[PDB]
Amino acid sequence: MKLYVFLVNTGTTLTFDTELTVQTVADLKHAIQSKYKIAIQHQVLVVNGGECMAADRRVCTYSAGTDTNPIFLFNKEMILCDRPPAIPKTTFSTENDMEIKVEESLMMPAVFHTVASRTQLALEMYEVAKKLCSFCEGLVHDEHLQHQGWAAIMANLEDCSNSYQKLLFKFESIYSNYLQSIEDIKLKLTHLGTAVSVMAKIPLLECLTRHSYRECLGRLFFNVSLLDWINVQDRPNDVESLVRKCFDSMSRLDPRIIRPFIAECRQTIAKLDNQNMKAIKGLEDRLYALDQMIASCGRLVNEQKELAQGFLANQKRAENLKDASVLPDLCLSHANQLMIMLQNHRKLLDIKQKCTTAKQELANNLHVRLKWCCFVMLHADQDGEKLQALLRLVIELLERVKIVEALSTVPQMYCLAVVEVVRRKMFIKHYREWAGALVKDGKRLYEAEKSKRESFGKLFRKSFLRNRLFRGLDSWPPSFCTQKPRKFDCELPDISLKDLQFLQSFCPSEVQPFL
Amino acid sequence: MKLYVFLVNTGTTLTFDTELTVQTVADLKHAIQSKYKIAIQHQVLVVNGGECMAADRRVCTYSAGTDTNPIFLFNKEMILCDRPPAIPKTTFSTENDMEIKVEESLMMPAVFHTVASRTQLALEMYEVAKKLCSFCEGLVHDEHLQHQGWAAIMANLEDCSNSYQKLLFKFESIYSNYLQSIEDIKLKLTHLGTAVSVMAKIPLLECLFNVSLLDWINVQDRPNDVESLVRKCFDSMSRLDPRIIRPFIAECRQTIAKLDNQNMKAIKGLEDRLYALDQMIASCGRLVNEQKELAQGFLANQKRAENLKDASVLPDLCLSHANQLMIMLQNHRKLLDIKQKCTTAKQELANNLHVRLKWCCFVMLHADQDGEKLQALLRLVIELLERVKIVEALSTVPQMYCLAVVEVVRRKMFIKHYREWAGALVKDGKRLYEAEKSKRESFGKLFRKSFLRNRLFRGLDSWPPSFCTQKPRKFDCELPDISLKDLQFLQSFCPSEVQPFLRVP
Amino acid sequence: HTEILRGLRFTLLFVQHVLEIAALKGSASEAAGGPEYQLQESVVADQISLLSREWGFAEQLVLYLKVAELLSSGLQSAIDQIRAGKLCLSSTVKQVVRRLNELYKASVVSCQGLSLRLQRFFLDKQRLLDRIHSITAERLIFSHAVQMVQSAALDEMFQHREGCVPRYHKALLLLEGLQHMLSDQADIENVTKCKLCIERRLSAL
Amino acid sequence: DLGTFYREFQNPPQLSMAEDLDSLPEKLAVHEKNVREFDAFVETLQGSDEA
């Protein structure tokens, strides 16, 4: 067996050693350059099954390429060539000899010597008769491989089409979300702009020094506002930049521009789904007729080679006999038979020309169909690139929406946080006074009771009644509320009551920071 | 290595298989009785250093058994008998037959066969003298072993005497302490009588009905009640009064004084006995050396006689033989005198050790009975000095009863106050903590730990310690339910003597 | 045939000793004597006993109840063996059975009287009597025998070697009957150890 | 061996009252019955016999 590749558009099989299994797909195109020669850029290769051979894979992967299943190749440059590509015609020189010598032998009288010369002529011509439709069997391969490669590239195109359909479906789903999210983001962007306006006149307290703890003295006037901090965190983005980019993306994603593009995408889907070009009108019955004619090869051979062998044997015997009563009639009968077999041989020539003509017209229709296929491929590539870019933009919008939502509340959360932190700073004061008082009293109680109990036990330890008549005298108080509770809220910054004052009087957050 | 044991009383070597070594003292006694027919119960066994055999320790643990340091077996049978034992000898008629032949050989004329008889006689005589020397040395080394036996029993005696003297001194000191406390003990007993009279009246509360505290004290550790304790103390005081103990300790000190009789522990004439018997051993060795020399000279003279066939030589050579024979007879009688002196010295040492051991056994038995008596008296005194501690405890019982009642009622009152105090504290603590936690949880829900949780307003995730949120653990759970009513009842009924311990908050 | 008379006679002797123990437990607390007798004892110990006598009365009652049970069982055995012809009807059986009957009558009367004069004491102290685990006649008899032997040994050591023999004999005869009363094998082994030690001493004498 | 005799006797090892006293009256009734029966029998112990 051997590795094989087949060129479909020109209908040309390619023979390769099975040994080449050790080399990649790029190496296989370069092997087509090594034995044959066509520039790699022209080479488009697909397998029965439709997979477009990835350059890095080795042929061992793909389960085809044999004598009985080469891989399909296409010179898309030749396809893009305006011309209908011509036949890589083979030079069948033997036909010239056959015609010339056939006429030569026919001209001379059909005497037994001339009939023997015609017998030799038959030995040559009607034996190469087998070669003729052996070559036509090569073409028979060519034809059914053409159908198979046609189907393979159509599996490839259909795969591209389902990828296109899924991509557009996801696009229209995310845009169905955007259907309401566009007005929602308009509202939320009004909200963010409102928030930006709000951040003016709500100063970032001098408690910045404490919020950035490491700097307080560690870095060893301007009323810095919440602006120039919100955007300072996330330095490169101005937040105003966030609004600007949201508006820009909204404009590009507007249905005004988007819906016509999706209409073009739908038309691209329709063209990808063009069953008319995807099919060939009656190629199956065409190949069925070709099957009938290749069968006619064998049938007619069963006519000729029979007659030829019989004539050869009979002429040998009769000429060796030199019988004048048998040679004339038998030889002339064989001459008329040779005339009819010459008609049959020429019929071989017409069927050869007919099958080559079939090759040519299928190749021309296939040239047009590959032009359509390449146009669809290019349109699909463009549309896929654009769809991916716009999907990236849509997801950018659908993430910046959450970023805007987060950054919108920041004045509300600043107010809530400042009020809560002052509340805790005062509640800890109250709780500390409270715990101090309670612990003082509890320690007093505990020490007094412990002193009394020990001063008694010291007397009662040396007694006969201890633990025999009187029980439980060795117990102690539960030591409850005796020691100061551990710390809490020590990590809260030193925001003053005067800081809430610093805010509220001349920095309107709209009342909310009021306690 | 091989095991040997000794009967010091007579001085007979006892030899055993090594199988007894893996065995122990009791097995040693049984083996002694079985193989040598000495009763087990009569066996007193001692090692160098003065240790007496406990029946438990394996014999080798006591480092003895070799021929130079065996176990010493002292027989009670032989000390119960008044007379000293008899000692055997190595008996042979060969000595007397040899003497008779030497006397006869002196009167046998000068002929070759006579000289042959002479040389045979002398060759045998050398061996006889050698065997006499060996037997004598066996006896004398056996004596030198009887001496380590006596010294071992002396060591045991000294250890026993020191222990007995220490015990007597200890009892004398403890008895002096008791003697200076007889009046105090009697006063404490009178006080216990008073305290029992008091306890008879103090009601016993339901710490578990005309039950008094005395009845409760009585039902404890019966039938050893307080009356039994007092009478036992009085019995011991009766048994320990100095009119008995002082004479008894006088008799004891007399016992130690007789234990100090160095005239019996030390063998007088020991040094002389060694100085004489070892010198006699040296003399017998020299005598046997001369005997061997002259026997070989006899052989040489026989060699000369058999070859010098001249009739004038044999008579003179036989005169020389007669002079030599007289020399050999003198040497033989000297060796036999050495034998007699050694045997009589062994018998004399046996008798002297017999008398000294009779004295030692008597002294040791007297000291042991005195030790038993003193141990009993020490136990009496210590038990009495503990019973007086019990007596003092019982004397102070009635006061401690009232004080414990007062303490229990006060503790009930304090618990009543403490539960209220803790209830108020926990009420307030739970109120405040729940309010604060509700507010903080509300703020956490509003903040959603999302927006500025740590970026700007750092560390809002902190809570109060839940201090004073749960009530204190239980305490004073086992105290008897001594109501204030019970204390009032005791103040109503208890005698005046223990009222001051009740009339207080 | 007459060995059963040995059993009855031993029962008689043992109860005649337990009755002596009971009498000693009575009002007259057994005091010491001689010039060494501290005159303070007859004051202090006598006072305490006069204060706590009723517990001694209860001990006397349990001892009398135990001797009543012993005599009842012994006489029931004698009754059965006389009725069945297993025991000789006359001769020495007469005197032993009649003496057992006399002692039984005395014991029944004594325990009835002590119950009558302790009825009030029991009704008063019942609340305390629950906590105390009942003191049994076996404990009392064993303790009395042990203390008798200890006292006799002390007296013998301190030159009184003559009057000790009867005390040892009485202690031995008490323990001989005490073993038959105990059921726990540990207690029986203890009693046997003490009895065999007393036997060793008596043989030494 | 008086010494070891005492030494082991220095302290030989030792060997709800309401229940026994509650059972007491029945016990004494039983005892009275028993004494009556024993007296009634021993009154009849006048025979002659030997074994």
Numbering used by the authors:
A (entry chain B): 1 to 220, 303 to 597
B (entry chain A): 1 to 208, 304 to 600
C (entry chain C): 840 to 1044
D (entry chain D): 462 to 476, 487 to 522
The authors write:
The unc-51-like kinase protein kinase complex (ULK1C) and the class III phosphatidylinositol (PI) 3-kinase complex I (PI3KC3-C1) are the most upstream and central players in the initiation of macroautophagy. FIP200 is the central scaffolding subunit of the ULK1 complex (ULK1C), which also contains the ULK1 (or ULK2) kinase itself, ATG13, and ATG101. PI3KC3-C1 contains one copy each of the lipid kinase VPS34, the pseudokinase VPS15, and the regulatory subunits BECN1 and ATG14. The two complexes coassemble through extensive contacts between the FIP200 scaffold subunit of ULK1C and the VPS15 pseudokinase subunit of PI3KC3-C1.
The ordered core of ULK1C was purified in a form consisting of the FIP200 N-terminal domain (1-640) and the ULK1 C-terminal microtubule-interacting and transport (MIT) domain (836-1059) fused with the ATG13 residues (363-517) responsible for binding to FIP200 and ULK1 ([Fig fig1]). Image processing and 3D reconstruction resulted in a cryo-EM density map with a local resolution of 3.35 Å in the best regions, including the FIP200:ATG13:ULK1 interface ([Fig figs1]). The structure confirmed the previous observation of a 2:1:1 FIP200:ATG13:ULK1 complex, while defining in residue-level detail how ULK1^MIT^ and ATG13^MIM^ bind to FIP200. The ULK1C core has dimensions of 180 × 130 × 90 Å, contains two molecules of FIP200^NTD^ and one molecule each of ULK1 and ATG13 ([Fig fig1]). The two arms of FIP200 consist of 120 Å-long bundles formed by three twisted helixes (81-495). The two arms are connected by an 80 Å-long dimerization domain (496-599) bent at nearly 90° to the arms, resulting in the C-shape. Cryo-EM density of for one copy of a ULK1^MIT^:ATG13^MIM^ heterodimer was observed on one “shoulder” of the FIP200 dimer. The ATG13^MIM^ collaboratively binds to both FIP200 and ULK1^MIT^ ([Fig fig1], [Fig figs2]), consistent with the role of ATG13 in recruiting ULK1 downstream of FIP200.
